[PDB]
Amino acid sequence: PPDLRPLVPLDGGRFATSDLNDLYRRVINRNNRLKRLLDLAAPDIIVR
Amino acid sequence: MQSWYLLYCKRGQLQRAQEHLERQAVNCLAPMITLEKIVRGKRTAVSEPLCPNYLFVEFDPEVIHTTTINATRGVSHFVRFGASPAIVPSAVIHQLSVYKPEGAFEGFQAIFTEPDGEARCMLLLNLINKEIKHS
Amino acid sequence: RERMGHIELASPTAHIWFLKSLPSRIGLLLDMPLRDIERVLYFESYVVI
Amino acid sequence: ETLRVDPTNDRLSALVEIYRMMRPGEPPTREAAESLFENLFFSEDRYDLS
DNA sequence: CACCACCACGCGGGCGGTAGCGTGCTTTTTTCGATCTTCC
DNA sequence: GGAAGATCGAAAAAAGCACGCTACCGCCCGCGTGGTGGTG
RNA sequence: UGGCGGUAGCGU
């Protein structure tokens, strides 16, 4: 849940680090890229 | 004894990686086709690669090691099937150099049909993987 | 604070806890050395089914 | 006794073994091993005894 | 009005490099190749 | 009478390293490309 | 309207 990994405001226009959010973002990026590659009928090396 | 490898060069430094690889006496290839695409004004010669961050290289590992290529500016890494970089014979780059307007020809017609850049280089790797399976 | 989410993975991925925490649960269950296990998981060798 | 234990019997074999210890996984090459050995301790750009 | 400057931005991930980086603790578990043994 | 079983020594990997409190600073993408706005 | 890291100090 987001409240357990909050994005607190820094009172300067930016936010915190939230390493959990960064790792989730990386996982989502990889999953979306893999889905797009599968939908494109990729060769073995690229999907691997 | 000579090996053709495929490099996933760094994002935005295709030309820089090209000149750096050419400086190290390494034969580098970037497939070139303009497709007469439409710039903001009208249709002109854009002259864009198949899709960026992709290069072909020819180099014998005995003379120049793969670590030097990995450390070359503008290039990130190779593509390795299993645990070793993919080996590529000369048929694909002969066909690529000769035809710059059979099954590879139909692939090129596909490239001229879709112009979706990711799809153009995607079918390019599809053809090269088909030949690798043939080899 | 309590509502959870989920991501549908395009391809299955091995759980690191059940793979790398010695003794390996997957390796013990499959009666196969761990080296084969994470050389197959990370796309370096083929395994017959 | 160390020489008897030592499996290498030539300069090239020793260089290849050193390269394998230094960089596991990479393919041991004559030029790469020689360059690594030269740059380990006999190069001013990498080794500096003040 | 196609050319420069400002801000979204996108995917990208280790970075910067034409390679390495590491360098003053102790205990427990795995494991893996090498060695000796013994019987089917 | 030469390969599985047992041993075994070395190499690697993982786990741990008292409690409570006070004060300060440094930092909390990125980068380098491209879409788009300003312009000689 | 929080976290991480470093530094120094106090009581044991």
PDB file of all heavy atoms in Angstrom, chain E residues 32-37, chain F residues 5-9:
ATOM      1  P    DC E  32      29.069 -27.239  -5.597  1.00  0.00           P
ATOM      2  OP1  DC E  32      28.167 -26.068  -5.553  1.00  0.00           O
ATOM      3  OP2  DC E  32      28.580 -28.522  -6.148  1.00  0.00           O
ATOM      4  O5'  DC E  32      30.392 -26.815  -6.386  1.00  0.00           O
ATOM      5  C5'  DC E  32      31.471 -26.206  -5.676  1.00  0.00           C
ATOM      6  C4'  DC E  32      32.749 -27.010  -5.839  1.00  0.00           C
ATOM      7  O4'  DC E  32      33.253 -27.412  -4.532  1.00  0.00           O
ATOM      8  C3'  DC E  32      32.602 -28.301  -6.646  1.00  0.00           C
ATOM      9  O3'  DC E  32      33.729 -28.465  -7.491  1.00  0.00           O
ATOM     10  C2'  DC E  32      32.566 -29.372  -5.561  1.00  0.00           C
ATOM     11  C1'  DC E  32      33.550 -28.789  -4.564  1.00  0.00           C
ATOM     12  N1   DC E  32      33.417 -29.352  -3.188  1.00  0.00           N
ATOM     13  C2   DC E  32      34.521 -29.360  -2.323  1.00  0.00           C
ATOM     14  O2   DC E  32      35.597 -28.890  -2.717  1.00  0.00           O
ATOM     15  N3   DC E  32      34.375 -29.881  -1.077  1.00  0.00           N
ATOM     16  C4   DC E  32      33.195 -30.376  -0.696  1.00  0.00           C
ATOM     17  N4   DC E  32      33.092 -30.879   0.538  1.00  0.00           N
ATOM     18  C5   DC E  32      32.067 -30.381  -1.564  1.00  0.00           C
ATOM     19  C6   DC E  32      32.223 -29.870  -2.788  1.00  0.00           C
ATOM     20  P    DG E  33      33.615 -29.316  -8.848  1.00  0.00           P
ATOM     21  OP1  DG E  33      33.088 -28.417  -9.898  1.00  0.00           O
ATOM     22  OP2  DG E  33      32.909 -30.580  -8.540  1.00  0.00           O
ATOM     23  O5'  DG E  33      35.133 -29.677  -9.191  1.00  0.00           O
ATOM     24  C5'  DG E  33      36.126 -28.660  -9.158  1.00  0.00           C
ATOM     25  C4'  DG E  33      37.331 -29.103  -8.348  1.00  0.00           C
ATOM     26  O4'  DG E  33      36.927 -29.372  -6.978  1.00  0.00           O
ATOM     27  C3'  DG E  33      38.019 -30.371  -8.851  1.00  0.00           C
ATOM     28  O3'  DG E  33      39.427 -30.196  -8.834  1.00  0.00           O
ATOM     29  C2'  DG E  33      37.570 -31.442  -7.858  1.00  0.00           C
ATOM     30  C1'  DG E  33      37.404 -30.637  -6.579  1.00  0.00           C
ATOM     31  N9   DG E  33      36.434 -31.218  -5.656  1.00  0.00           N
ATOM     32  C8   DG E  33      35.110 -31.473  -5.911  1.00  0.00           C
ATOM     33  N7   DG E  33      34.475 -31.993  -4.899  1.00  0.00           N
ATOM     34  C5   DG E  33      35.440 -32.095  -3.907  1.00  0.00           C
ATOM     35  C6   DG E  33      35.338 -32.589  -2.585  1.00  0.00           C
ATOM     36  O6   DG E  33      34.339 -33.049  -2.017  1.00  0.00           O
ATOM     37  N1   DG E  33      36.553 -32.515  -1.912  1.00  0.00           N
ATOM     38  C2   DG E  33      37.721 -32.023  -2.446  1.00  0.00           C
ATOM     39  N2   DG E  33      38.797 -32.031  -1.648  1.00  0.00           N
ATOM     40  N3   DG E  33      37.830 -31.557  -3.686  1.00  0.00           N
ATOM     41  C4   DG E  33      36.653 -31.621  -4.355  1.00  0.00           C
ATOM     42  P    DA E  34      40.380 -31.221  -9.620  1.00  0.00           P
ATOM     43  OP1  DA E  34      41.346 -30.420 -10.406  1.00  0.00           O
ATOM     44  OP2  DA E  34      39.520 -32.212 -10.305  1.00  0.00           O
ATOM     45  O5'  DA E  34      41.168 -31.976  -8.452  1.00  0.00           O
ATOM     46  C5'  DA E  34      41.908 -31.223  -7.503  1.00  0.00           C
ATOM     47  C4'  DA E  34      42.336 -32.092  -6.336  1.00  0.00           C
ATOM     48  O4'  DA E  34      41.197 -32.356  -5.478  1.00  0.00           O
ATOM     49  C3'  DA E  34      42.912 -33.456  -6.724  1.00  0.00           C
ATOM     50  O3'  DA E  34      44.124 -33.682  -6.019  1.00  0.00           O
ATOM     51  C2'  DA E  34      41.819 -34.445  -6.309  1.00  0.00           C
ATOM     52  C1'  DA E  34      41.166 -33.723  -5.143  1.00  0.00           C
ATOM     53  N9   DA E  34      39.774 -34.105  -4.920  1.00  0.00           N
ATOM     54  C8   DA E  34      38.735 -33.973  -5.797  1.00  0.00           C
ATOM     55  N7   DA E  34      37.586 -34.396  -5.325  1.00  0.00           N
ATOM     56  C5   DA E  34      37.891 -34.829  -4.046  1.00  0.00           C
ATOM     57  C6   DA E  34      37.104 -35.389  -3.021  1.00  0.00           C
ATOM     58  N6   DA E  34      35.792 -35.612  -3.141  1.00  0.00           N
ATOM     59  N1   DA E  34      37.719 -35.710  -1.864  1.00  0.00           N
ATOM     60  C2   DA E  34      39.033 -35.485  -1.748  1.00  0.00           C
ATOM     61  N3   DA E  34      39.876 -34.965  -2.640  1.00  0.00           N
ATOM     62  C4   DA E  34      39.236 -34.655  -3.778  1.00  0.00           C
ATOM     63  P    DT E  35      45.005 -34.992  -6.313  1.00  0.00           P
ATOM     64  OP1  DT E  35      46.428 -34.602  -6.211  1.00  0.00           O
ATOM     65  OP2  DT E  35      44.505 -35.617  -7.557  1.00  0.00           O
ATOM     66  O5'  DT E  35      44.652 -35.961  -5.093  1.00  0.00           O
ATOM     67  C5'  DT E  35      44.747 -35.478  -3.759  1.00  0.00           C
ATOM     68  C4'  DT E  35      44.490 -36.590  -2.761  1.00  0.00           C
ATOM     69  O4'  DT E  35      43.063 -36.722  -2.528  1.00  0.00           O
ATOM     70  C3'  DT E  35      44.982 -37.971  -3.194  1.00  0.00           C
ATOM     71  O3'  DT E  35      45.586 -38.630  -2.093  1.00  0.00           O
ATOM     72  C2'  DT E  35      43.698 -38.673  -3.634  1.00  0.00           C
ATOM     73  C1'  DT E  35      42.688 -38.073  -2.672  1.00  0.00           C
ATOM     74  N1   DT E  35      41.284 -38.119  -3.170  1.00  0.00           N
ATOM     75  C2   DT E  35      40.290 -38.575  -2.335  1.00  0.00           C
ATOM     76  O2   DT E  35      40.495 -38.953  -1.196  1.00  0.00           O
ATOM     77  N3   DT E  35      39.036 -38.573  -2.886  1.00  0.00           N
ATOM     78  C4   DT E  35      38.684 -38.168  -4.161  1.00  0.00           C
ATOM     79  O4   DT E  35      37.527 -38.203  -4.565  1.00  0.00           O
ATOM     80  C5   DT E  35      39.774 -37.702  -4.983  1.00  0.00           C
ATOM     81  C7   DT E  35      39.515 -37.239  -6.385  1.00  0.00           C
ATOM     82  C6   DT E  35      41.007 -37.699  -4.453  1.00  0.00           C
ATOM     83  P    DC E  36      46.538 -39.903  -2.326  1.00  0.00           P
ATOM     84  OP1  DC E  36      47.858 -39.580  -1.741  1.00  0.00           O
ATOM     85  OP2  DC E  36      46.443 -40.299  -3.749  1.00  0.00           O
ATOM     86  O5'  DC E  36      45.870 -41.039  -1.422  1.00  0.00           O
ATOM     87  C5'  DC E  36      45.627 -40.787  -0.045  1.00  0.00           C
ATOM     88  C4'  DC E  36      44.549 -41.708   0.495  1.00  0.00           C
ATOM     89  O4'  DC E  36      43.266 -41.356  -0.081  1.00  0.00           O
ATOM     90  C3'  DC E  36      44.761 -43.196   0.205  1.00  0.00           C
ATOM     91  O3'  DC E  36      44.598 -43.946   1.400  1.00  0.00           O
ATOM     92  C2'  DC E  36      43.675 -43.525  -0.824  1.00  0.00           C
ATOM     93  C1'  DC E  36      42.589 -42.527  -0.464  1.00  0.00           C
ATOM     94  N1   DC E  36      41.686 -42.192  -1.600  1.00  0.00           N
ATOM     95  C2   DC E  36      40.307 -42.382  -1.468  1.00  0.00           C
ATOM     96  O2   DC E  36      39.862 -42.831  -0.405  1.00  0.00           O
ATOM     97  N3   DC E  36      39.498 -42.064  -2.512  1.00  0.00           N
ATOM     98  C4   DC E  36      40.023 -41.581  -3.639  1.00  0.00           C
ATOM     99  N4   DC E  36      39.193 -41.280  -4.643  1.00  0.00           N
ATOM    100  C5   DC E  36      41.426 -41.381  -3.789  1.00  0.00           C
ATOM    101  C6   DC E  36      42.211 -41.695  -2.755  1.00  0.00           C
ATOM    102  P    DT E  37      44.784 -45.542   1.397  1.00  0.00           P
ATOM    103  OP1  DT E  37      45.388 -45.916   2.695  1.00  0.00           O
ATOM    104  OP2  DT E  37      45.457 -45.934   0.138  1.00  0.00           O
ATOM    105  O5'  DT E  37      43.285 -46.094   1.354  1.00  0.00           O
ATOM    106  C5'  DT E  37      42.337 -45.630   2.306  1.00  0.00           C
ATOM    107  C4'  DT E  37      41.003 -46.336   2.141  1.00  0.00           C
ATOM    108  O4'  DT E  37      40.271 -45.757   1.027  1.00  0.00           O
ATOM    109  C3'  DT E  37      41.089 -47.833   1.853  1.00  0.00           C
ATOM    110  O3'  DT E  37      40.048 -48.502   2.541  1.00  0.00           O
ATOM    111  C2'  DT E  37      40.889 -47.899   0.341  1.00  0.00           C
ATOM    112  C1'  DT E  37      39.884 -46.779   0.135  1.00  0.00           C
ATOM    113  N1   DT E  37      39.872 -46.212  -1.241  1.00  0.00           N
ATOM    114  C2   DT E  37      38.665 -45.991  -1.861  1.00  0.00           C
ATOM    115  O2   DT E  37      37.594 -46.255  -1.346  1.00  0.00           O
ATOM    116  N3   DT E  37      38.756 -45.452  -3.114  1.00  0.00           N
ATOM    117  C4   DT E  37      39.909 -45.114  -3.797  1.00  0.00           C
ATOM    118  O4   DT E  37      39.887 -44.634  -4.924  1.00  0.00           O
ATOM    119  C5   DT E  37      41.141 -45.365  -3.090  1.00  0.00           C
ATOM    120  C7   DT E  37      42.455 -45.040  -3.736  1.00  0.00           C
ATOM    121  C6   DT E  37      41.065 -45.894  -1.858  1.00  0.00           C
TER     122       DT E  37
ATOM    123  P    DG F   5      27.672 -44.731  -4.176  1.00  0.00           P
ATOM    124  OP1  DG F   5      26.298 -45.269  -4.280  1.00  0.00           O
ATOM    125  OP2  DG F   5      27.894 -43.270  -4.247  1.00  0.00           O
ATOM    126  O5'  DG F   5      28.328 -45.264  -2.816  1.00  0.00           O
ATOM    127  C5'  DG F   5      29.743 -45.332  -2.696  1.00  0.00           C
ATOM    128  C4'  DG F   5      30.172 -45.442  -1.247  1.00  0.00           C
ATOM    129  O4'  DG F   5      31.613 -45.345  -1.179  1.00  0.00           O
ATOM    130  C3'  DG F   5      29.678 -44.326  -0.346  1.00  0.00           C
ATOM    131  O3'  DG F   5      29.726 -44.745   1.014  1.00  0.00           O
ATOM    132  C2'  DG F   5      30.694 -43.227  -0.627  1.00  0.00           C
ATOM    133  C1'  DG F   5      31.986 -44.022  -0.828  1.00  0.00           C
ATOM    134  N9   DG F   5      32.832 -43.481  -1.886  1.00  0.00           N
ATOM    135  C8   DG F   5      32.429 -43.047  -3.126  1.00  0.00           C
ATOM    136  N7   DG F   5      33.408 -42.606  -3.866  1.00  0.00           N
ATOM    137  C5   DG F   5      34.532 -42.750  -3.065  1.00  0.00           C
ATOM    138  C6   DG F   5      35.886 -42.446  -3.333  1.00  0.00           C
ATOM    139  O6   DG F   5      36.373 -41.962  -4.363  1.00  0.00           O
ATOM    140  N1   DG F   5      36.708 -42.750  -2.250  1.00  0.00           N
ATOM    141  C2   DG F   5      36.274 -43.287  -1.060  1.00  0.00           C
ATOM    142  N2   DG F   5      37.209 -43.516  -0.127  1.00  0.00           N
ATOM    143  N3   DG F   5      35.006 -43.581  -0.799  1.00  0.00           N
ATOM    144  C4   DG F   5      34.195 -43.291  -1.844  1.00  0.00           C
ATOM    145  P    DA F   6      29.373 -43.716   2.198  1.00  0.00           P
ATOM    146  OP1  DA F   6      28.778 -44.502   3.300  1.00  0.00           O
ATOM    147  OP2  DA F   6      28.631 -42.572   1.623  1.00  0.00           O
ATOM    148  O5'  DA F   6      30.800 -43.177   2.678  1.00  0.00           O
ATOM    149  C5'  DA F   6      31.709 -44.058   3.323  1.00  0.00           C
ATOM    150  C4'  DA F   6      32.993 -43.336   3.689  1.00  0.00           C
ATOM    151  O4'  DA F   6      33.719 -43.000   2.479  1.00  0.00           O
ATOM    152  C3'  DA F   6      32.800 -42.029   4.461  1.00  0.00           C
ATOM    153  O3'  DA F   6      33.645 -42.013   5.607  1.00  0.00           O
ATOM    154  C2'  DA F   6      33.181 -40.943   3.454  1.00  0.00           C
ATOM    155  C1'  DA F   6      34.156 -41.664   2.538  1.00  0.00           C
ATOM    156  N9   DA F   6      34.166 -41.128   1.181  1.00  0.00           N
ATOM    157  C8   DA F   6      33.093 -41.001   0.344  1.00  0.00           C
ATOM    158  N7   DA F   6      33.391 -40.481  -0.822  1.00  0.00           N
ATOM    159  C5   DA F   6      34.754 -40.257  -0.748  1.00  0.00           C
ATOM    160  C6   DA F   6      35.676 -39.722  -1.666  1.00  0.00           C
ATOM    161  N6   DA F   6      35.336 -39.304  -2.889  1.00  0.00           N
ATOM    162  N1   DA F   6      36.966 -39.637  -1.280  1.00  0.00           N
ATOM    163  C2   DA F   6      37.302 -40.059  -0.054  1.00  0.00           C
ATOM    164  N3   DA F   6      36.524 -40.577   0.896  1.00  0.00           N
ATOM    165  C4   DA F   6      35.249 -40.650   0.481  1.00  0.00           C
ATOM    166  P    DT F   7      33.719 -40.713   6.551  1.00  0.00           P
ATOM    167  OP1  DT F   7      34.002 -41.184   7.923  1.00  0.00           O
ATOM    168  OP2  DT F   7      32.526 -39.874   6.302  1.00  0.00           O
ATOM    169  O5'  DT F   7      35.005 -39.933   6.010  1.00  0.00           O
ATOM    170  C5'  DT F   7      36.222 -40.640   5.829  1.00  0.00           C
ATOM    171  C4'  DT F   7      37.337 -39.717   5.374  1.00  0.00           C
ATOM    172  O4'  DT F   7      37.197 -39.422   3.958  1.00  0.00           O
ATOM    173  C3'  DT F   7      37.403 -38.362   6.082  1.00  0.00           C
ATOM    174  O3'  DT F   7      38.762 -38.055   6.344  1.00  0.00           O
ATOM    175  C2'  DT F   7      36.800 -37.411   5.046  1.00  0.00           C
ATOM    176  C1'  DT F   7      37.315 -38.032   3.763  1.00  0.00           C
ATOM    177  N1   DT F   7      36.541 -37.665   2.542  1.00  0.00           N
ATOM    178  C2   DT F   7      37.204 -37.111   1.470  1.00  0.00           C
ATOM    179  O2   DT F   7      38.400 -36.882   1.469  1.00  0.00           O
ATOM    180  N3   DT F   7      36.410 -36.827   0.391  1.00  0.00           N
ATOM    181  C4   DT F   7      35.049 -37.043   0.277  1.00  0.00           C
ATOM    182  O4   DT F   7      34.422 -36.751  -0.736  1.00  0.00           O
ATOM    183  C5   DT F   7      34.417 -37.630   1.433  1.00  0.00           C
ATOM    184  C7   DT F   7      32.943 -37.905   1.428  1.00  0.00           C
ATOM    185  C6   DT F   7      35.186 -37.915   2.496  1.00  0.00           C
ATOM    186  P    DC F   8      39.174 -36.868   7.345  1.00  0.00           P
ATOM    187  OP1  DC F   8      39.589 -37.493   8.620  1.00  0.00           O
ATOM    188  OP2  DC F   8      38.114 -35.836   7.349  1.00  0.00           O
ATOM    189  O5'  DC F   8      40.481 -36.265   6.654  1.00  0.00           O
ATOM    190  C5'  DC F   8      40.639 -36.371   5.241  1.00  0.00           C
ATOM    191  C4'  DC F   8      40.713 -34.996   4.611  1.00  0.00           C
ATOM    192  O4'  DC F   8      39.804 -34.920   3.474  1.00  0.00           O
ATOM    193  C3'  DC F   8      40.308 -33.849   5.544  1.00  0.00           C
ATOM    194  O3'  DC F   8      41.173 -32.746   5.347  1.00  0.00           O
ATOM    195  C2'  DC F   8      38.897 -33.528   5.073  1.00  0.00           C
ATOM    196  C1'  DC F   8      39.075 -33.723   3.582  1.00  0.00           C
ATOM    197  N1   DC F   8      37.795 -33.832   2.823  1.00  0.00           N
ATOM    198  C2   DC F   8      37.736 -33.373   1.502  1.00  0.00           C
ATOM    199  O2   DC F   8      38.759 -32.909   0.984  1.00  0.00           O
ATOM    200  N3   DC F   8      36.562 -33.463   0.828  1.00  0.00           N
ATOM    201  C4   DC F   8      35.485 -33.971   1.431  1.00  0.00           C
ATOM    202  N4   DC F   8      34.347 -34.041   0.732  1.00  0.00           N
ATOM    203  C5   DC F   8      35.526 -34.434   2.780  1.00  0.00           C
ATOM    204  C6   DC F   8      36.687 -34.340   3.433  1.00  0.00           C
ATOM    205  P    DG F   9      42.134 -32.244   6.531  1.00  0.00           P
ATOM    206  OP1  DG F   9      43.015 -33.372   6.907  1.00  0.00           O
ATOM    207  OP2  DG F   9      41.286 -31.596   7.556  1.00  0.00           O
ATOM    208  O5'  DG F   9      43.036 -31.127   5.828  1.00  0.00           O
ATOM    209  C5'  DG F   9      43.610 -31.384   4.553  1.00  0.00           C
ATOM    210  C4'  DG F   9      43.283 -30.267   3.577  1.00  0.00           C
ATOM    211  O4'  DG F   9      41.992 -30.515   2.953  1.00  0.00           O
ATOM    212  C3'  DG F   9      43.192 -28.873   4.197  1.00  0.00           C
ATOM    213  O3'  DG F   9      43.794 -27.927   3.330  1.00  0.00           O
ATOM    214  C2'  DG F   9      41.686 -28.650   4.310  1.00  0.00           C
ATOM    215  C1'  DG F   9      41.185 -29.364   3.067  1.00  0.00           C
ATOM    216  N9   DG F   9      39.789 -29.784   3.159  1.00  0.00           N
ATOM    217  C8   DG F   9      39.173 -30.348   4.247  1.00  0.00           C
ATOM    218  N7   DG F   9      37.917 -30.630   4.046  1.00  0.00           N
ATOM    219  C5   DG F   9      37.681 -30.227   2.741  1.00  0.00           C
ATOM    220  C6   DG F   9      36.493 -30.284   1.975  1.00  0.00           C
ATOM    221  O6   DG F   9      35.385 -30.719   2.315  1.00  0.00           O
ATOM    222  N1   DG F   9      36.679 -29.768   0.695  1.00  0.00           N
ATOM    223  C2   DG F   9      37.865 -29.261   0.216  1.00  0.00           C
ATOM    224  N2   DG F   9      37.855 -28.807  -1.046  1.00  0.00           N
ATOM    225  N3   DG F   9      38.988 -29.203   0.927  1.00  0.00           N
ATOM    226  C4   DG F   9      38.821 -29.702   2.176  1.00  0.00           C
TER     227       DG F   9
END
